Amino acid sequence: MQEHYQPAAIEPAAQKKWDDARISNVSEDASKPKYYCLSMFPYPSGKLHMGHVRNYTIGDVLSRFKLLNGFNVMQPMGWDAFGMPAENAAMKNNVAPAAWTYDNIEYMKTQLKSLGFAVDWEREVATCKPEYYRWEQWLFTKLFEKGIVYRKNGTVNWDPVDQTVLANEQVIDGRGWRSGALIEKREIPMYYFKITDYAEELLNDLDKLEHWPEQVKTMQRNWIGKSRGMTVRFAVSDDSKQGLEGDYAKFLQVYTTRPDTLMGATYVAVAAEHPLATAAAADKPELQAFIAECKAGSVAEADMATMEKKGVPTGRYVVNPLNGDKLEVWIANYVLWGYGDGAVMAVPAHDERDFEFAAKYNLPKKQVIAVGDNAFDANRWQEWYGDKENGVLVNSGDLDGLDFQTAFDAVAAKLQSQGAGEPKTQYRLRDWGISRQRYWGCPIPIVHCEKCGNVPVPADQLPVVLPENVVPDGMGSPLAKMPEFYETSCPCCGGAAKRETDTMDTFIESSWYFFRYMSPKFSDGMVSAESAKYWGAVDQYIGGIEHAILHLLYARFFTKLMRDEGLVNVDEPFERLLTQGMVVCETYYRENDKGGKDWINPADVELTFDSAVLKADGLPVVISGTEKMSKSKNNGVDPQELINAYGADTARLFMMFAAPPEQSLEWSDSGVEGAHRFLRRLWRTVYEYLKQGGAVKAFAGNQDGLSKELKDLRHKLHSTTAKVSDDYGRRQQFNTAIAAVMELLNQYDKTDTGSEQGRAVAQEVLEAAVRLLWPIVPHICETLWSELNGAKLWEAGWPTVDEAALVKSEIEVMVQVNGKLRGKITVAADASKADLEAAALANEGAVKFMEGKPAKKIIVVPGRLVNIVV
Numbered sequence: 001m002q003e004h005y006q007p008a009a010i011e012p013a014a015q016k017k018w019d020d021a022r023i024s025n026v027s028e029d030a031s032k033p034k035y036y037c038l039s040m041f042p043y044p045s046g047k048l049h050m051g052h053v054r055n056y057t058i059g060d061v062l063s064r065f066k067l068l069n070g071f072n073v074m075q076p077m078g079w080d081a082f083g084m085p086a087e088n089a090a091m092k093n094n095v096a097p098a099a100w101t102y103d104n105i106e107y108m109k110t111q112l113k114s115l116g117f118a119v120d121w122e123r124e125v126a127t128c129k130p131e132y133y134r135w136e137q138w139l140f141t142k143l144f145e146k147g148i149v150y151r152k153n154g155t156v157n158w159d160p161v162d163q164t165v166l167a168n169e170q171v172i173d174g175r176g177w178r179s180g181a182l183i184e185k186r187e188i189p190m191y192y193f194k195i196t197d198y199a200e201e202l203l204n205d206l207d208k209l210e211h212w213p214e215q216v217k218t219m220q221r222n223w224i225g226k227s228r229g230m231t232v233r234f235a236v237s238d239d240s241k242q243g244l245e246g247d248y249a250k251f252l253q254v255y256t257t258r259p260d261t262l263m264g265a266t267y268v269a270v271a272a273e274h275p276l277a278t279a280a281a282a283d284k285p286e287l288q289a290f291i292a293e294c295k296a297g298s299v300a301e302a303d304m305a306t307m308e309k310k311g312v313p314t315g316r317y318v319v320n321p322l323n324g325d326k327l328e329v330w331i332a333n334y335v336l337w338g339y340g341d342g343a344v345m346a347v348p349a350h351d352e353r354d355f356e357f358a359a360k361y362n363l364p365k366k367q368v369i370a371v372g373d374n375a376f377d378a379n380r381w382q383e384w385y386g387d388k389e390n391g392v393l394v395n396s397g398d399l400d401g402l403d404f405q406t407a408f409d410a411v412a413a414k415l416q417s418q419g420a421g422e423p424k425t426q427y428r429l430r431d432w433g434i435s436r437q438r439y440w441g442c443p444i445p446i447v448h449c450e451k452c453g454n455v456p457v458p459a460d461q462l463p464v465v466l467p468e469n470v471v472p473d474g475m476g477s478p479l480a481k482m483p484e485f486y487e488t489s490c491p492c493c494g495g496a497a498k499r500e501t502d503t504m505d506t507f508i509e510s511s512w513y514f515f516r517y518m519s520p521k522f523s524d525g526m527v528s529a530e531s532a533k534y535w536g537a538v539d540q541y542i543g544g545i546e547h548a549i550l551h552l553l554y555a556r557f558f559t560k561l562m563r564d565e566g567l568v569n570v571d572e573p574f575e576r577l578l579t580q581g582m583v584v585c586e587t588y589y590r591e592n593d594k595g596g597k598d599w600i601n602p603a604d605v606e607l608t609f610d611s612a613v614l615k616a617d618g619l620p621v622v623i624s625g626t627e628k629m630s631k632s633k634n635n636g637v638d639p640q641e642l643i644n645a646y647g648a649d650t651a652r653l654f655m656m657f658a659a660p661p662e663q664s665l666e667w668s669d670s671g672v673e674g675a676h677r678f679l680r681r682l683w684r685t686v687y688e689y690l691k692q693g694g695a696v697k698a699f700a701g702n703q704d705g706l707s708k709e710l711k712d713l714r715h716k717l718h719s720t721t722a723k724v725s726d727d728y729g730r731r732q733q734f735n736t737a738i739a740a741v742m743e744l745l746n747q748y749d750k751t752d753t754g755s756e757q758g759r760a761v762a763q764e765v766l767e768a769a770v771r772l773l774w775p776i777v778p779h780i781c782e783t784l785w786s787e788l789n790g791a792k793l794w795e796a797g798w799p800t801v802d803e804a805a806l807v808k809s810e811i812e813v814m815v816q817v818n819g820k821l822r823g824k825i826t827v828a829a830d831a832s833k834a835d836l837e838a839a840a841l842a843n844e845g846a847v848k849f850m851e852g853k854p855a856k857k858i859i860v861v862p863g864r865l866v867n868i869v870v
């Protein structure tokens with residue numbers, strides 16, 4: 001054994017040993033219990049940083065723990081390769097997005113290989129390869145003919161100067177990001193997944209996910225946004241019907257989740273596009289100006305909760321069907337034409353939005369709910385005004401005194417008897433719009449024929465291959481300017497036709513890649529039946545909370561679609577979910593000549609303290625704040641530079657030790673140093689042990705006759721094994737597991753293990769320590785193991801707990817009656833004061849000197865004495 005720890009030498013050797021043994025290349029082996037651990041695959045945008053590394057080290061820790069316990073572990077990696085990163089680089093470096101993507105994949109793969117993750121690289125997928133995306137093109141065509149995928153006009157952000165569609169993230173105060181031109185709201189045909197048809201299933205199946213963080217489930221529930229409410233129709237008054245046609249001349253229909261407050265409605269409000277708004281605005285130019293300002297605004301809910309709610313009265317009136325009140329119709333900018341009826345009722349006394357609205361315009365507030373003895377001040381809003389659970393109705397005639405659910409059910413029966421309303425369920429969830437007007441994405445497998453319409457490409461003709469010899473420039477999608485791509489024949493009639501040139505939302509690739517890993521070379525379907533049946537569901541998923549809503553919802557949706565197609569037989573894709581905390585790091589920059597400032601990477605700066613200078617120009621730089629490690633502020637620490645300086649094991653150890661996995665983790669030079677020093681200590685410990693006599697048979701079995709100090713070391717040892725097993729398996733708290741092993745080594749260091757029995761216990765401790773830590777730092781542990789023991793580490797398995805090592809020795813306690821010694825008892829070291837009392841009262845000499853008299857008091861001195869006063 002070499003005396004000094006040399007990571008640069010032993011880590012490549014360990015990785016080659018693991019690669020040669022194929023321990024991470026797994027099949028569908030029925031002779032082993034399966035375990036599928038999955039980390040969210042990265043966008044191949046250039047270079048991974050230590051943030052990504054924390055995510056993938058956590059998954060590798062869990063994967064190696066399960067492997068040591070005899071599981072058939074699949075831990076796959078792959079590349080979420082489509083999307084805008086490459087398209088921007090194509091404009092920047094004037095390179096094809098495909099070529100840029102593959103160059104990044106190759107570099108990042110070596111980044112990952114250098115870290116020694118136990119990954120099945122034979123299952124690697126890159127989602128921009130036709131062999132992958134053909135199968136989501138396939139599922140698209142199957143769902144299209146079922147109507148689950150459909151085509152309809154939707155609204156987009158049209159930049160007339162750049163001649164491109166833009167996301168809402170790129171429209172700023174109504175103008176494009178790179179243009180500043182007024183964006184036009186344009187209606188174009190697009191493709192949608194009818195995810196609303198699955199809303200109730202997607203909502204209710206969250207209850208099955210007993211091992212998901214509650215916040216993630218809460219966020220999905222709020223996103224789906226189911227509500228149980230009431231459709232309510234207000235008869236349009238006879239004087240308010242001019243210019244109204246059909247049903248709009250008859251009633252105003254609204255949706256409310258508070259039908260128990262319908263007796264308290266004081267006005268109603270309609271969207272600017274509502275037919276009542278249009279008719280009243282006919283002769284009123286003030287109503288036209290307000291309607292125009294509404295439609296010109298952004299309907300995004302982010303801008304709308306921060307929006308000043310405004311309205312104008314219309315002079316039109318409707319009649320409350322429960323009490324006959326004549327209520328004026330207002331046009332209001334908060335009423336959305338597309339959610340429900342585009343019209344709402346207003347109850348200012350019991351909804352905070354209606355209270356503030358009616359406080360601005362001095363509209364009536366009528367109390368219909370009392371909550372105990374709480375006083376109702378019509379000029380101030382109180383949190384109990386909206387309490388659904390603890391209130392009963394007042395000023396409601398038939399309904400007085402009922403609670404929320406009783407009044408709900410009563411108003412439902414009343415309105416249905418009058419034909420003026422009925423219960424209705426709504427969802428905030430909208431259908432999922434697939435279409436993107438971008439080049440670097442999966443082509444939509446639709447052909448447009450003037451005779452046959454929008455027809456799907458037949459399964460025999462899939463994939464529609466995205467051409468990779470393309471350099472986009474930002475003046476519209478290049479597919480729309482390539483007749484060699486879009487000119488084709490119609491698959492139904494054979495006539496001349498045109499391919500759809502929009503591509504798919506790249507969330508599509510990530511909505512099913514976890515099934516593709518199960519059979520990534522299968523060419524008869526998305527996932528082979530035998531492999532899906534073997535691997536079942538992902539046992540463990542690890543990824544950032546930024547994907548807890550959309551990605552997770554889409555993946556759960558695809559799972560159910562694939563189930564209903566007969567491709568898989570699980571309802572849910574991910575059984576356990578771990579959301580790792582973000583790695584954060586200080587930033588640095590300097591102001592550029594073009595006004596705006598540009599950011600400098602940490603490893604390119606030099607910091608002196610008690611000046612911050614650029615490591616190249618030797619000029620000082622700005623030392624700004626600490627935030628999430630990312631490419632935007634260029635504060636990503638490249639693992640490869642850390643590995644060159646300290647080794648992969650030092651990188652993995654720092655990430656797993658510095659913080660609980662869910663807690664944010666601040667980059668620290670001192671923290672990296674503390675990990676290396678521990679690895680030196682670990683190496684030093686095994687070397688000095690083998691120096692002083694060489695390897696021996698590890699102690700096992702009956703420990704009677706072992707010295708007190710060695711019994712205590714074995715007690716610490718097997719307590720540590722139980723603890724680390726619980727931290728890895730149940731708690732998933734890796735920082736405390738490492739601390740536990742460090743405590744074992746501290747006690748080892750304080751124990752004389754020179755004797756024959758001392759060496760056997762020393763062998764037992766070190767053999768356990770190196771296996772306990774192997775999921776965290778497998779390179780040094782693999783090498784140290786082989787110097788300790790000739791068996792294969794993965795065949796020796798996870799360390800077992802010796803329960804006999806956890807039994808402490810028994811105590812002898814004196815039993816006195818009225819202070820005079822009358823007997824002796826033998827008690828457990830863990831015996832409570834009540835067990836000491838019981839054993840003492842049952843001592844022969846105690847009962848023979850208590851003379852049947854009861855005990856007036858019993859003094860218990862643990863470990864020394866029990867005195868029975870009688």
Ligand SMILES: CC(C)C[C@H](N)C(=O)OP(=O)(O)OC[C@H]1O[C@@H](n2cnc3c(N)ncnc32)[C@H](O)[C@@H]1O
Pocket residue numbers: 040041042043050051052054055080510542543544545546547551580581582583584628629630
């Ligand atoms: C399933 C797909 C939709 C996933 C998509 N391709 C994606 O998110 O890919 P991306 O490459 O962006 O990130 C890959 C993983 O790394 C995590 N991550 C990134 N930065 C940090 C950081 N500073 N600290 C901690 N963790 C971080 C991030 O949460 C994610 O789980």
Ligand SMILES: Nc1ncnc2c1ncn2[C@@H]1O[C@H](COP(=O)(O)OP(=O)(O)OP(=O)(O)O)[C@@H](O)[C@H]1O
Pocket residue numbers: 225226227255256257258334335336337338339340341342343344345428
């Ligand atoms: N088109 C619409 N635009 C704006 N608000 C609407 C629209 N349709 C209904 N509403 C209002 O939204 C209220 C509640 O609907 P929803 O469940 O979507 O929201 P919420 O705030 O989550 O629910 P709640 O008020 O019960 O807590 C209804 O009572 C109604 O007054």
Ligand SMILES: [Mg+2]
Pocket residue numbers: 208
């Ligand atoms: Mg269950």
Ligand SMILES: [Zn+2]
Pocket residue numbers: 449450451452453490491492493494495
């Ligand atoms: Zn045709």
